Amino acid sequence: ERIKLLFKEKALEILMTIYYESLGGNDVYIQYIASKVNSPHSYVWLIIKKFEEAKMVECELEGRTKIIRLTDKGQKIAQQIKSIIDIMEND
């Protein structure tokens, strides 16, 4: 909510979902991101393409499965956002 004050909530949760899922050791599937966030599949896809345009993620097809990975740039950004979230939540 203080988060909504500064961030686009939907795009943020997509980015951080990719971050935590990859950090945990999972290949990140677009379907998985959808199950975790409050957006329809088509909206997730749209945001992923925007991230790709911004050189923050790369995606590739493995058969019928879309896999998303953070670029070094996307990773740094997610890490910094993680700290902002921490700071915002700690009074």
Added chain:
Amino acid sequence: ERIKLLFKEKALEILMTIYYESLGGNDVYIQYIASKVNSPHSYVWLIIKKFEEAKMVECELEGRTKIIRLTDKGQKIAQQIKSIIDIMEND
């Protein structure tokens, strides 16, 4: 624009305006923030109140002049956003 992808552009520019103005040594006046950002005075005031609620700024009246200052919390957040902006702009 990649900024708009993740951030609320209007709130962001208000926060960073406070950050750079204070860093330069100015008392930050609400009127000044308005001259720098693309928002009407009343919208700036609304955002400032939200920041105040989030304990990121404090404001006070000096006569008829509203002065805004970042709290330690607001300062840390602005600093982290500064790095994100830098990262986003450097390919």
